[PDB]
Every structure is written in C-alpha cells, then in structure tokens.
Amino acid sequence: KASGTLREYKVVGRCLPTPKCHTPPLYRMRIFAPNHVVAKSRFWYFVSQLKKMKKSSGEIVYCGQVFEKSPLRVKNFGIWLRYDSRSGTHNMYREYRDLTTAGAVTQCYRDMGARHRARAHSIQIMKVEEIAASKCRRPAVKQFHDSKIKFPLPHRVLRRQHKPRFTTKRPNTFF
Amino acid sequence: SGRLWSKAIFAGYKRGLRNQREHTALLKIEGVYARDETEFYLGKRCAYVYKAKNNTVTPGGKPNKTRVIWGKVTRAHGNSGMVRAKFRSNLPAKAIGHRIRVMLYPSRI
Amino acid sequence: EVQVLVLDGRGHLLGRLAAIVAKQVLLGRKVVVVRCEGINISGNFYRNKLKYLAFLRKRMNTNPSRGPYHFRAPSRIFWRTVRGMLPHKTKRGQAALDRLKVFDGIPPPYDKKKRMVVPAALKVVRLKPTRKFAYLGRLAHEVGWKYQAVTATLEEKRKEKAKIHYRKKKQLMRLRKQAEKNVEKKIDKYTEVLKTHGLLV
Amino acid sequence: KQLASGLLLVTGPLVLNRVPLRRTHQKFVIATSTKIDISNVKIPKHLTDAYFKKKKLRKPRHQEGEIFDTEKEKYEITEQRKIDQKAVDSQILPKIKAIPQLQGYLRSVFALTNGIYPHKLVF
Amino acid sequence: VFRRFVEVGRVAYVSFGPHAGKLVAIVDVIDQNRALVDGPCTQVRRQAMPFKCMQLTDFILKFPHSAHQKYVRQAWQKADINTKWAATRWAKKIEARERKAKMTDFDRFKVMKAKKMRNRIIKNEVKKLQKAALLKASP
RNA sequence: CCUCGGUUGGCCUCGGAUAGCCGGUCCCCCGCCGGGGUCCGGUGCGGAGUGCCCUUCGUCCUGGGAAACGGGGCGCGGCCGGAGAGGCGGCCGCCCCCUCGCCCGUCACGCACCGCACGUUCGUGGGGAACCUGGCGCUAAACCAUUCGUAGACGACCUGCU
RNA sequence: GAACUGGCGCUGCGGGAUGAACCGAACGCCGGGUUAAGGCGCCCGAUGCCGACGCUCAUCAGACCCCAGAAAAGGUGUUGG
RNA sequence: CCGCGGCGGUGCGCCGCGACCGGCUCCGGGACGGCUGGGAAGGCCCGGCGGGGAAGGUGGCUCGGGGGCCCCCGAGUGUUACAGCCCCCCCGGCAGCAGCACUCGCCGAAUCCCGGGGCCGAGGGAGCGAGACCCGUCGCCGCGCUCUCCCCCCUCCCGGCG
Ligand SMILES: [Mg+2]
Ligand SMILES: [Mg+2]
Ligand SMILES: [Mg+2]
Ligand SMILES: [Mg+2]
Ligand SMILES: [Mg+2]
Ligand SMILES: [Mg+2]
Ligand SMILES: [Mg+2]
Ligand SMILES: [Mg+2]
Ligand SMILES: [Mg+2]
Ligand SMILES: [Mg+2]
C-alpha cells in the first residue's frame, strides 16, 4: 500500500448466501486507504485474517467514504496499531492532533515511517478514537493543551533563495 | 534608440545524458525563472546574430559582416524559464553561452 | 549581466556557492569571487581539516611532481572546487574556467564596487544554527597557506577606508534628506504622482 | 480604422513623430491599454488598401539592363497624401492635446533598459 | 526581542498560498506547524493553515480559543482591523508595491518625466547646501 | 587597406548580526572633526538591489515653471588622494561661450522612402603591415667566433680582450 | 551437476558512472507529441517547488535491485514504544 | 509585332512576411449539470424553552510578585458569572450547496462554448450530365433563401430638404 492523503472508508461485506445460511452475517470495518479500490482490497485482507472468508467467497455490499464529523475543531486522536519490524512484531499506541481522523492516520503513517522505518504494508491499524485532552498520554500532545498557549517563531529561514538568486543584501531572520 | 528585443543565452541543445538533438535549442531568457512566466515568449521570434569575414547583403541596408540565423520559440522547457526554441539551421556549437535575441515579433498582445 | 559579477565569499558554503557559480559561468557571465578566506564549510573544523589532509596524501608515488596539485590558498581551494563542477577537459569547460576569477581578500580593482551575496549558499539560511562549521581561511592557514596574517592586516586596512566612504555616504544622504525637507512646495506635485504609482509610499 | 485586407490603418500625428497615414500588420505591433476616444472623426472614404498599395514603374520596354534606371529612386509624396494627412490630423490633434503630456509620450520611442523585462511589463 | 508571539487571536498575514495577501486571525494551535486560522471579514473561511505561510502582525484580538465564527467576526468588527491595518505603514507599503506592478506604459513615461524633475530640483539644490557648508575656516 | 569578433545604459565599496538589526538626535570624552550613554523613529527591511540613477526623435516660433551661484570645453596651469593587482579618482586658478539645454505648454517643419529582417550602443573596438603629416626626442645590445676552467659527454655554465 | 521460464550467444537503444546476462524496451529514413525503467545541486536534459512530516552529527557519517564490502555483542547519544 | 490586357495551367533568380482552411498535439479561460449520509461540516436568524456535562477554567473569588489602601502577572477555585466549549433538543427558520469566502470528493448521453503555442499540407481527371466545350466551385453530410403573403427596424441612386 502506497499513500497520498488518506481517506477513511467504511466497508460492509458478507459472504454470498450459501444454501446453508441464506442470510449470512454482515461485516463492517473502517479502512483507511487512498481510494475505494484500495479500501475494498484492504477490507478482504483484514476480514480473511479475521474470519474464514475470501473475496471469492464474499462480496462488498457498501463502500463509501466517511466524511469527518467535525473537521473544524482541533482534537486529539489515539491510534492503537501493530506493526512488524526487522525483528518480531509489536503492538503500539500513539497520539496525534489533527482536524480530520484520516489526517491523523496519515500523520501516523508518516510518523511511523519516519521513526521506526515501517513501510505502510507492515502497519495494521486496529483502533482509532477521539481522546479527551485529560486522558492523553503522550507529552508531545499534552504540551498543546493550554488556553493561553504562547510561542514566537524564532528562526524564519529564507525560503525564496532563488527569487532573487543574486542580491546585495544578506537576509534577516528575526521578525 | 532602443534595445527592442529580449536578451537570452544559448544554453545548449536538447539532450539526454548521452544523446543530444541539435535541431532544438534551449534558451535562458534573463528575467524569467519559472514556467508560468514563459507564456509571453512562447511564439516570439528568436535571432542569433554573429559576424564573419566576408560581407553579406543586409536587407534595408548596405552589405556588412553581420549574419543572422533565424528561429522561433516553441514551448517551455522545465519548471524554470529556460524555454526551448527551433532555428532554420541548427545553431553552431560555438554559440553556447552567447547572446540570442528574442525579437518581440508576432505579439499576442 | 554584461558587467562582471562580484561575489562576497564571506558567510558562504563552499559547495553551495560553487555549484551556483559553475552554472553561472557556463553561460558566459564572467564572475569574480572575492574574500575567499570567508567561505565556510559545513561540519566541525577538525573533520574538514582531515578531509583536506586526506587530499594531501593523494599523490603519485612514482613522481609526485606530476601528481595532484594541492593548492593551499583559499582562492585556489575554492577555484579547484569549481574546477570539479565544470567540464575542464573540454573546450567549453576551459573557456568557462577563464571567465572565473578568485581572490583572497579584495584586491583594489574590486573593493570600489558593490559586492553581491547569493542567498542559496549562505550559511545563515542553509545550516541549522546548532551545527558546527569551519572557515576556509583558517583551514587554509593550517594546511600550508602563508598569507593568513598579511591578508587579515590588509583586509583590516581596507575596512577602515570603507568606513570613511560610508560616513561620507551617510553625510551626503542626510544632506539629501534635509534637502527634500527644504524644497517641499516645488516638489509636492512631483512627489504625489510618484505616490499614485507606488514609488515612495 | 482597420482596413479590409486586415492591415491596420494607423497614423502618427505627423507633426509629432514623423509617421504618416500608413498601414501596419496587426501581429507586429504592441497594443497598449491607453486609448483616446476618436469617435466622431471623419476618415475619408478613399483610404482603401489600394490607396496605400506600392506603385511600381520598371520595367517598360527595357530587356537588356545596361543604362540603369536612375530615375524614380525617389518616391515622391503625392500632394493627395499631404491633404489627407492634414485632413485626418486636423481633427485628431486638438483631441490628443486634451489628455496631458500625451505628445511627449507619443514623441518618445519605446525601448528596453537593462532592468525591466517585457513579460513583467503591463502595457 | 520577540516583540510579537503566536497567541490565540493573533492576526497574521498570509504571504503565500491559496489565500496569499489576505489577513487572518488564528483560533487555535496544532502540532507546532499548523494553526486553526479564520478570518471572517477578510473573506477567508475557517481552516487549518501552516505556520510557514503567515506573517505575524502586532494586532491582537481577545476571544476564547476555539471560539465559534460569530465571536471572531464581532471581535473583528469592534476595534476593526481593516482600518488600523490598511493605513498601517506595512499595508500601504505592499499596496503601493502593487500599484508599481499595475503601472502602464503611459504611466511609466509620466513617472520617468516626473522623476527627472524630482531629482533635478534635489540635485541642483544639494549643491547649494554643500557650498553653504564650505564656509568653515575656523580654528 | 588585411584580420578578430564580442556587446546592444550605469550603480563610485560600511562593517556585519540573525534568539536581532537600520537610521536620527541631546549630554560625556579622543588631539573643531570622531567615541560612548540617554532620547526618537523603521523593522516582512521603503534611507527598500522586489532597489537606485539616467533616459535619445531633432529642431523652429512661443509662454509658464527650475535655476542664475550653471553647464559643457581630450582648452590650459597647478594641487590632493589611492601600492594588495595604486594604471584610478577628486579638487583649485585662468581662458570661449549662452542663458541653450531639465518639466509643462504654444507653433510648424524634417524623404512621410508608401507593412516587413542583420535596425539601436559600447566604438574614434582589439590586432597586422603601410603613406602622408607636424613637434619633441635616443644613438644599443645579444649571439657566433676567440680566450678562460671556479664548468663540462655535446650543448650549457663561470670568465678576459687599446 | 539438474528442473521451469526468460535472456545472452545472434541484440542495437534508454537507465544502472563503468559492464555479454539486471530494469525498461527490442531497431527501416525522418518531423511533432507522450512515456517506460530511471532521474531533476553542478559535471548533466530536468524540482531556480516559498514541497509535506519526522529521524540523524559520525576525530573511518550516509547515499538506491543484480552490486561490488560486514557479524556476534554492546552505548545513561538521541527518538518512539 | 506591340499592350506593364484578360482568362487557363506552369513558374518565382535569391531572401522573406502574412492570411484563412484542414490533420496532429500541448495548454489556457468561461459557463452548465448529476451523485453522495437525496453530501459532511459550515453561515445568518443576539435561536429561541431548556436539560445535561466537563475543562486546554470566564468572571468572581484565595496566596504570592510589581505600577499611585488604588491598577497589571503567576499559582489553587469551579460550572456562567463581567467569557466561552460539547451533547440532547420539543422543534428549528433562511440563504447557499461539493460555494466567483479556494475546508474535504467522484463524475459528464448527468457537457458545452471560446482562445493561444508548436509540427504538418501527403495525395491530384471526384463531370452517369450537358451529349460536358473557360477550369468538374463535385460526392456524402449539415444548413440558408426563392418560385406564398404580410408586417417591423436601420437604410438608399434618395425627391425637394429646415
Ligand atoms: Mg537480451
Ligand atoms: Mg558461437
Ligand atoms: Mg533470438
Ligand atoms: Mg546504457
Ligand atoms: Mg554502479
Ligand atoms: Mg522523436
Ligand atoms: Mg545522473
Ligand atoms: Mg541543468
Ligand atoms: Mg456545479
Ligand atoms: Mg498534392
């Protein structure tokens, strides 16, 4: 699985009605995939691991994006995920602050890739919750819970280094 | 009493790393350092002006030592000005890092 | 630019400065880089010195006189770095090399000119503040350069002459600031038009 | 006005910049954003392209060219052109005199310096 | 040092990006890189914007963090920013930077003629100030 | 005359910091100029290189504004500054000129070459033989040969000769 | 020394600096356009994007299939769990 | 034989410019519609009757720090106060609607118009009709007008014109 800006898909599936249980149970899951094609394929991967059913012995009954309920309020997300490193695999819990839950999972994929070098195919996210700041655990997020939060912007590095590329005056950083 | 043409530099023919196609030339125009700026110059006529020993007839004038290889700008070449152009006869390699005028000819303005 | 382009190597990063210069000289545009002893190289001083001490050890053992020429002056050090970025073995590259000029300090055809600085190669913007760097001039003096002291003296003498020029410029600019303070009614209709057009906010 | 052949009939106010009633190509000129309203001016009907078409003389009954045609090398301004220029300019000069310092603007010659570039310029 | 900080209710100027040149006041801070900015009266709706684009200004509003949009616009209306800014020295500086770009060919002629006199009157009169300064022969 | 082509306005300079800078002023102290400390401003730099300066159609009537204390003369004579690669720059006195040149106006003309490109500068370019033209000037060395042996395979080197 | 498929031999071209076999792709002589694998500081065509998020300081740093150099075991160096 | 004659084809001695038409391609504007959770949120109507909740804790309080017992900062206080936030509403109303306030999609029988840059011009007797006769301005396809009559608005050799 590659990435992009991740999108949360709810996928509902079931086995074909065999003439033994004409109404098989319906199964719903939350898949985070770049598009509905990948989301459907990821659905069978988790379901076949979970319960004895294959894509051939089943079908998708619904696959639609889950728009963020409150994409205009900052919130803290707690992601429970497991992944396999070069050694054996591990269970892990991380916290992120973002407007959209898909944006949090994207952050988790990059943060996991940046720190533990875990490629996206190595990661399985099992749980994503909206976590209240009082219940947050990571100090990286706890430091952002303050009504009178205050910080300057110390080093403003020049980013227009080539417009112009030649100029008599050296830039200044403090503002 | 006026420069009347844009000043550009012959940067080299279009090429890969080991294959070069002399039938198009890459010109860097001073003042354009992005793709979107190149839209102005995308059709204009570019001229390479040089001198020689023998005199050559000059239209609207007396014979002189100046000769010109004409051409016109085709399309932008990559993310920062440096548009690519085609000439009637492929430019000599001695003109690399020399002046090519962009002559403000047929204007869409 | 038809005129030669003078650059102040003080505060500049060796490779970052040379890569810009090498392209700038491959397209004509004669270029001069003054104050080569002010160039900075990223990384702590000791590890950069070892990098040059390694280069001293590269030498044709059968006949070192034909081996690599380890130039010691900071200008020659910077000039050699550009030489690696150009096709010096081809005619086009050799011609580009001749367009370049490198100087320690600022000799006196160039100190009377407005120096230029490239931001894409500045140590202030390209290096994190909590990183150790090294001066080219100090490194050169420690690998064989014999003119750290004399250049520093001559450079200081140049700086004092510049201050006199700068005090005169401020004197004449203050005098001009007073001037527009005097002529106000004979200028108001000319100031205003430039104000409608963005000049002199 | 633009002519029937597509060539733009333009004039310089001859007393100002030495450009008479003359055609010019549309694609070979730069149109600026500065306009002067020339409504209710009278353009004579006899200014077709056939008027400004170049007249040619040589070569009537000369096959072997040895005695050179040293005459007609001077294109003469026909008096008819003189009156037309004065007629059209008569009603256009006082109108351009209204907007300030247009004459000096039109007397000047457009040019590029070692600063500005044409793409950045808004004409 | 550090005259201005990133507070809740701090007005910043969006230098580059989709809303380049607009004005905006942040509502909340996120992950040290993005801020919940929102400008109701500057025609930029509430959204997350990175800290790398905006330009910090001395203007500060007072309202609770994560306040709803109705509270920001009234705090923007009272002690209104578009008149303090825009008739602040920074704003007329960039807007005059805009006027220079829009200048047409005829305008460029008038400025060139006007600037010719402008410097002519200065240059021919500074020579009177220097010659007036030459009367210095005291011990 | 033979040959080489480039280019198509100039910027005449603080030192530098970046978790800071820039400009201005009132008091103290360095042999009537600088250095400190207060105070005042600007700081997405506007005393801004995203900047500044010049800007060219030429003239003729013709007024209004700028200036008159000015310009241009390779015209002269003299002074001063710069040594890192000064190869440069600045300033006084004399003499010719005109209120001309810079903005806004009045007035009309110039080949207006009839749609067309290499146009426009640097530039009186660099280089090579040569004629005329005036003035001011100078009248030498090297190598061979011959000696020397502080030198030497030959060259080379050290040497001497009204 | 065998099995299946492909290739080299018989094969040029783009990339891997370099290379019979790898990756892309197979070839009449050309113009335009677009790609593959691979790349876009400079050599060297192309990121001269106000690219996004983090990690990392090395007194032998690291830098891309085949591939051209490394292990067991350690660190109160830092990061996450 | 002459006309700088026309009509046909065939050309230009070199160097060029332009026009529309068509094929191919890369881009740029402008507008329309569908679907979705018959979009999610969101904006205005101080949202009105409220109920409930907590803290990234408003006001008010307590202790500790400064400026002329008065005014600002920090730390504990909780439920609305001299701020706010979230859920449930008994119910909402209006506008717009994947927004020309650029938060987040997939699409076009639910899709059309206009423009720009570049390369190209290959081919050469298409006349079922007259019995071709100046040269086929022709097939397919899409159109317009006339062999029907009225009106309406600019006009026009106009007819005198005020
Ligand atoms: Mg093969
Ligand atoms: Mg064999
Ligand atoms: Mg075979
Ligand atoms: Mg290869
Ligand atoms: Mg290799
Ligand atoms: Mg091709
Ligand atoms: Mg490469
Ligand atoms: Mg390149
Ligand atoms: Mg729509
Ligand atoms: Mg044909």
From Swiss-Prot, chain A:
One Gene Ontology CC term in the entry: cytosolic ribosome
Positions where Phosphotyrosine occurs in the chain: 62
GO biological process: cytoplasmic translation; translation
Residues with PTM Phosphoserine: 70, 122
Entry-linked InterPro entries: Ribosomal_eL20 (IPR028877), Ribosomal_eL20_dom (IPR023573), Ribosomal_eL20_eukaryotes (IPR021138)
Superkingdom of the organism of origin: Eukaryota
Gene Ontology molecular function: any one: RNA binding
Modified sites of kind N6-succinyllysine: 75
Keyword presence, Cytoplasm: yes
Subcellular localization(s) per the UniProt record: Cytoplasm
Chief location category: cytoplasm
Keywords from the UniProt entry: Cytoplasm, Isopeptide bond, Phosphoprotein, Ribonucleoprotein, Ribosomal protein, Ubl conjugation
UniProt cross-link Glycyl lysine isopeptide (Lys-Gly) (interchain with G-Cter in SUMO2), position: 10, 127, 169
Family the entry assigns: Belongs to the eukaryotic ribosomal protein eL20 family.
Function: Component of the large ribosomal subunit. The ribosome is a large ribonucleoprotein complex responsible for the synthesis of proteins in the cell.
Subunit structure: Component of the large ribosomal subunit. Binds IPO9 with high affinity.
Xref: PANTHER family: 60S RIBOSOMAL PROTEIN L18A (PTHR10052)
The protein, known as: Large ribosomal subunit protein eL20
Organism listed in the record: Homo sapiens (Human)
UniProtKB/Swiss-Prot annotation, chain B:
Keyword Thylakoid applies: no
Pfam family, one: Ribosomal_L35Ae
Gene Ontology terms for molecular function: RNA binding; structural constituent of ribosome; tRNA binding
Annotated localization: Cytoplasm
Disulfides per UniProt: none
UniProt modified residues of type N6-acetyllysine: 7, 62
Ribosomal protein recorded as keyword: yes
Keyword entries, A-Z: Acetylation, Cytoplasm, Diamond-Blackfan anemia, Disease variant, Ribonucleoprotein, Ribosomal protein, RNA-binding, tRNA-binding
Gene Ontology CC: cytoplasm; cytosol; cytosolic large ribosomal subunit; cytosolic ribosome; extracellular exosome; membrane; synapse
Positions of modified residues (N6-succinyllysine): 62
Primary location class: cytoplasm
GO biological process: cytoplasmic translation; ribosomal large subunit biogenesis; rRNA processing; translation
Disease involvement: Diamond-Blackfan anemia 5: A form of Diamond-Blackfan anemia, a congenital non-regenerative hypoplastic anemia that usually presents early in infancy. Diamond-Blackfan anemia is characterized by a moderate to severe macrocytic anemia, erythroblastopenia, and an increased risk of malignancy. 30 to 40% of Diamond-Blackfan anemia patients present with short stature and congenital anomalies, the most frequent being craniofacial (Pierre-Robin syndrome and cleft palate), thumb and urogenital anomalies.
Purpose: Component of the large ribosomal subunit. The ribosome is a large ribonucleoprotein complex responsible for the synthesis of proteins in the cell. Required for the proliferation and viability of hematopoietic cells.
Family, per entry: Belongs to the eukaryotic ribosomal protein eL33 family.
Organism this protein belongs to: Homo sapiens
Gene transcribed to yield this protein: RPL35A
UniProtKB/Swiss-Prot annotation, chain C:
Superkingdom of origin organism: Eukaryota
Entry's family note: Belongs to the universal ribosomal protein uL13 family.
Function field: Associated with ribosomes but is not required for canonical ribosome function and has extra-ribosomal functions. Component of the GAIT (gamma interferon-activated inhibitor of translation) complex which mediates interferon-gamma-induced transcript-selective translation inhibition in inflammation processes. Upon interferon-gamma activation and subsequent phosphorylation dissociates from the ribosome and assembles into the GAIT complex which binds to stem loop-containing GAIT elements in the 3'-UTR of diverse inflammatory mRNAs (such as ceruplasmin) and suppresses their translation.
The entry's keywords: Acetylation, Citrullination, Cytoplasm, Phosphoprotein, Ribonucleoprotein, Ribosomal protein, Translation regulation
Organism: Homo sapiens
Subunit structure, interactors included: Component of the 60S ribosome. Component of the GAIT complex. Interacts with EIF4G1.
Post-translational modification: Phosphorylation at Ser-75 upon interferon-gamma treatment in monocytes involves a DAPK1-DAPK3 kinase cascade and is causing release from the ribosome, association with the GAIT complex and subsequent involvement in transcript-selective translation inhibition.
Pfam families: Ribosomal_L13
PROSITE patterns given in the database record: RIBOSOMAL_L13 (PS00783)
Gene assigned in the entry: RPL13A
UniProt-listed InterPro entries: Ribosomal_uL13, Ribosomal_uL13_CS, Ribosomal_uL13_euk/arc, Ribosomal_uL13_sf
N6-acetyllysine carried by residues: 189
Phosphoserine: residues carrying this PTM: 75
Swiss-Prot record, chain E:
Protein's GO biological process: cytoplasmic translation; ribosomal large subunit biogenesis; rRNA processing; translation
Gene Ontology molecular function: cadherin binding; RNA binding; structural constituent of ribosome
Localization (cell): Cytoplasm
Residues with the N6-acetyllysine modification: 78, 84
Sites of Phosphoserine modification: 138
Described function: Component of the large ribosomal subunit. The ribosome is a large ribonucleoprotein complex responsible for the synthesis of proteins in the cell.
Subunit annotation: Component of the large ribosomal subunit.
UniProt-recorded name of the protein: Large ribosomal subunit protein eL14
Species per Swiss-Prot/TrEMBL record: Homo sapiens (Human)
Gene giving rise to this polypeptide: RPL14
Residues of the full protein shown: 2 to 140 of 215
